[model samples]
Structures are given as C-alpha cells and as structure tokens.
Target: TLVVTTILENPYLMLKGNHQDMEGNDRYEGFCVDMLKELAEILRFNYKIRLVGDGVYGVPEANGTWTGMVGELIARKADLAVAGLTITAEREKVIDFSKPFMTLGISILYRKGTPIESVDDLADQTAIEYGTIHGGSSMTFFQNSRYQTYQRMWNYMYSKQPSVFVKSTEEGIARVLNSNYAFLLESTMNEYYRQRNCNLTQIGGLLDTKGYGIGMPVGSVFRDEFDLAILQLQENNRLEILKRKWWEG
Candidate 1:
C-alpha cells in the first residue's frame, strides 16, 4: 500500500466532523481527499493517508534539513505528498512535483474602505502594513524577486520595524480586519472561500502565479503516472468540478 502524507488545510484536506469516530481514511474529507480518492480509481492503487507529523507545509531549517510533508517525501516515508502544497523550484530540487492539479496566485485580503486597492498601492505606502504567513511561499516570492515593484515591496516588508510577517493565515486575516493591515496570501480559487468570510475581501489582482501539485520522492515512477492522471483530470474538467464542490460549497 502507498503511504500518502498530507497537511490539513481548509477546503483542501480536513478532518470530518465525525472523524474521531472514524478510522483510517474515513477520518477525513475535502478537496484533496476526494481528488486522491478519484485518482486511485484511475491509478488502481490502495493507500493510507498520514498527516504530516508536524503540521507545517515543509520549509528548510537553519541547519538546512527539510521539514513537513516534503521531508516525509525526501525520507521515503511517504509515496505521495498532497495538500495545498505549491510547485516551487526549491521544493522540486528535492522532490518531484506533479503537473499542477490546481493553479493559484498570490493576492491580498483586506477590509473595505481605507483605499487599499492593489499591490502597487500596498507596496508604495506604509500607511497600511501588509504581510503574509512568515516563511510561506508568498513571502519567499517577494524575497527573491528581481522585478522593480516586487523588489521594493520586499524591501518594505523586510525593513518594517516590527516585522509584518504573520505566523499564520488566521493571524494575518485578523490583523487585516482589526488594524491597519493588509495580508499578502495566495488565491483565485481561494476567492470562492473568501466569499464566505464576513466583511473581509480579496483586493488587487494576483501578485504572482503558482500551481499546487502533489509531491513525490525523486524518480518515483508514480510521478509520471500521476502527472498523466492529473492532466487527464484537468482536460476532462474534473478539477474545476472539484473546486466548485469544495471551495464553493
């Protein structure tokens, strides 16, 4: 049986309300769960889903060791790594990232009024403080960016005295609603989820583009197999149907 490692994230993978009373895969439900379930139909494999030991999405450490779902893949403990994990150059260096199952882009979430409109306005002024989840892909995007706007945006975020980097998505959202703050986070499909939250809204177009793909250990044959399945799913519009089922529900 394949051991699949994944992180729990809303609309992506999450515990069912009766999860405590369920066993094994029955314990969870959501987008990725359904996708994996469907993929297994296409691939003819049985698997067990294990939540990453730590809830992190995997980032490198001070000593350069990997952590989170990526580490599990690198360690060969997980045959598949799933969740809202992004396809990134840094991650691809260590693990195989499948053809995108979903595409996402960086964007801002903010409250109404106060003139916050786009990335241009957010980056050019300090009147409103903005940040993303610290160590998240969004922050990394700004950090290594060479574009004029992104470079200065990085400088502003990096030089802010108290540090605008939020520790979590919930924290960043609250900061935007409760104070003079804006949040740099990922989305598009996420726009559907944002529609459910009360007064908070996504402002500005996508700041950067990226895709969410499953991760596999290097040279794993399943990598090619799954990419083909993902491509088929995309072409058949199954991915869009799943997005509407989960994010729009």
Candidate 2:
C-alpha cells in the first residue's frame, strides 16, 4: 500500500467527524481527499494515509525557519504528498507534480483593527507580523533574487522578535486572530477561510500567483496516472462535483 502524507489544513484537508480522534470515520476529508479517492478508484489501488512528522520543517514557527513537509517528501518518508502542495520551481527540482487541480494567488489577512490599508503599507510597518506559506511558491519571493526589492522588505519584517510564522494559511489566520496586530499572507486559501469566518478579511492583493498540485517522488510512475485522472475528472465535471460535495457538504 502506498503511504500518502498530508497535514491538518482546513477547507483543503481536515478530520471530518471527530476532531479528538483524528483517525475515526469520516476522519480525513477535503478537496484533495476527494480527489485522491477518485484517483484511487481509477488506479484500483489501496493506500494508507498518514500525517507527516510533527516536527516537519514547513509546519510553522514564530521566526519562519521551517521546511518540514518538503523535507518529509524528499526523504521518501511517504509515497505521495496530496495536501494543498503547490507547484514551485524549487520543489520541481526534487519531485514531480501533477497537473494543477486548482489555481490561486496570495493575499494578506490582518487584524481588523490594523491601520494597514494596502499591501504596500506592509513595507513601512514593522509592528505587524506576517505569516506566509513556508514551502509554497510564495517562498520564491523570499528566496529569489529577481524579487530583490520584496525580499529585502521581507528580511526586515521577519527579522524582528515575536514575529509569527505558520505552515498553512489557516494557521496563519488563527495566529492573526488570536495574536493582536498580526498578519498572514497566503494564497486563495485565505479567501476560502475569510468567506466562512467573519472576523477575517483579505487585505492585500496577490502576493505571488501559482497553482496547486499533487506531489510525488521524482520520476515516479504515478505522475501520468494522476495527471490523467485529474484531466478525466475535469472532463467529466467530476472535479466540480467533488468540489461542491466536499467544500459545502
């Protein structure tokens, strides 16, 4: 059985029935979950799903020095990563990604009381903490040289003490809500959360636009299988069916 690794991200993937007993019935269900179930039916394969290591790098931290989920996939700890993993140039170097199942762009979520009016306002403010996707394409803005101006701005912002960092946009929003004067910059993931949760709102424009896809070991035979499955789902409109079923149901 293939061991698929994932995380506790919401609106994307989360335990459904009981939060306490994560492995219980209806335990794991979400967008990727439904997609994987369909792919499994097509491939006629049985697989065991598990969360990656708790200490995994991309899990999240205050200072943002993490890369756990990516590390787990690269270490061959799991056969596939079907979380809300994004397609990025860096990750593509070590692993293969299926056709994008979803497209998204980054936005910022901040405390309701913050004075920050726009994404540009972030450049002048150091009092607020901004959290970003640790391993997603957004990280390219932090690590890439072409976006030197934005990178410099981030270096100044993240270097401060008590600055919060989180692995997922959900976690980042949680931090922004619980911690006063905090902000989280994430993909359309934040848009989903903000619509459902009244307290938060999207403040900034897209930080870096990209697509989300399933990740596998480099040169894995599963890539074509997943790609075709995704295409078939789109063609049959099963993709929309699954989205509505899991997203609203």
Candidate 3:
C-alpha cells in the first residue's frame, strides 16, 4: 500500500466529523482526499492517508535538513503527498511534482477597512505590519529580487521593530483579525478564508501565478503514473468538478 502524507489545510484536507470514530483514511474527507481516492481507483493502488506529524509543508533549513511532508518524502517515509503544495523550483529539486491541478497567485489577506490595498501600499505603510508563513511560497515571492517591490516590502516587514514572520497561516489570520496586520498567502486560501470570515478580504490582484501539485520523492516510480492520472482527470473535467465541489459548493 502507498503511504500518503497530507496536511490539514482548509478546503483541501480535513478531518471528517466522525473522524474520531473512524480508522485510517476513513477518518478524513476533503478535496485532496476525494482526488486521491479517484487517483487510486484509476491507478488501482491501495493507499493510506496520514497527517504530517509536524503539521508543516516542507521547507529547507539552514543545516540543509528538510521538515514536514517534504522531509517525509525525502526520507522515503511517504510514498505521496497531496495538499495545497505549491510547485517551486527549489522544492522540485528535492521532490517530483505532478502537473498542476490548480493555478493561483500570491494575495494579501487582511481585515476589512485596512489601508493596505496593494503591495506598494504595504511597503509604504508602517502602522500595519505585514505577515507571511515563514516557509511558504508567499514568503519566497517577497524574498526574491525578481519582484523588487515585493523585496522592498519584505525588507520593510523584516527590518521593522517587530518581526512580521508568522509560524503558520492560522497565526497570521488571527493577527489580521485582531491587529493592524495583513497576511500574505496564496490567493486560493485568501478567497477560502474570506468566504468563511466576512470580516476578511483579499486586496489587489495576484502578485504572481503558480500551480499547486501533488508531490512525491524524487525519481519515485509512481511519478509517471500519477502525472498520467492527473492529466486524464483534467481532460475528463473531473478535476474542475472536484474544485467546484470543495471550493464553491
């Protein structure tokens, strides 16, 4: 059986209401779960879904050690990983990613009535501290020099009296709700959260477009089959149907 590692990110992977009474994969249900079920059915493989023990998306540390699901895959502890895993060049070096099933961009998530409407506004403001998930794609977007304005904004946030780096998206969202803080996150998540919390909204257009993909250990034998299954699902429109069921249903 394939060992699948997943994260509990909203609208992607989540525990079922009766999760406590269920066992193994039966305990969870969400977009990724359903997608994985379909993929397994098409590929004729048995799999088990387990949450990442550390509850983090993988990111490299200064010591060159990896953490979270990526670490699991690198260590060959997980045969597959599915969630809101963004496809990044850095991450691709260590793991294989299937064709993107969803496309999104970086967005600003903040409470209503905030003065920040764009990245430039964020860079110009001091009263509002901008925050982002430390190892997430949004953080990478700002830290890179490719986007000079975003780089300046990142510098402003990091050099300020108090650091704006958040340990998780939950903390960043909480900060946005209760303080003068704006969270930088994926547009998909920003929209999902905005729907759940009327007090929150996304500002400005997307910063950069990126794709979310399923990840596996580099050179894994399953990569080719997984990519083919994803492509078939895309061609048959099942992928869009699943997105609508989870995100818009």
Best by TM-score: 3
- What are the RMSDs of all candidates, in order? 1.8, 4.1, 1.5
Model 3 C-alpha lDDT per residue in residues 57-86, reported as the tens digit of each score: 988999988898999999999998899999
lDDT at 2, model 2: 81
Residue by residue across 5-88, what tens digits does model 2's lDDT show? 887776667777666666532578788778878888988877777787773424333463335566566668877887777677
Write the candidate numbers in order of decreasing TM-score: 3, 1, 2
Residue pairs clashing in model 2 are 56-68, 57-67, 57-68, 58-67, 58-68
Model 3 stretches astray by more than 4 angstroms: none
User: Candidate 2's C-alpha lDDT?
Assistant: 0.68
lDDT of 1 by residue, 1-249 (tens): 899998777778889997889999999999999999889999999999999997778788878778989898989989999888888999988889888988889988888766867788777886888887777788889899889889998888888879788876667777877888888888843375477776777777887678998999999989888988998899999999998888775
Higher-scoring candidate on TM-score, 1 or 3? 3
Quantify all predictions' global Cα lDDT against the true fold. 0.84, 0.68, 0.86
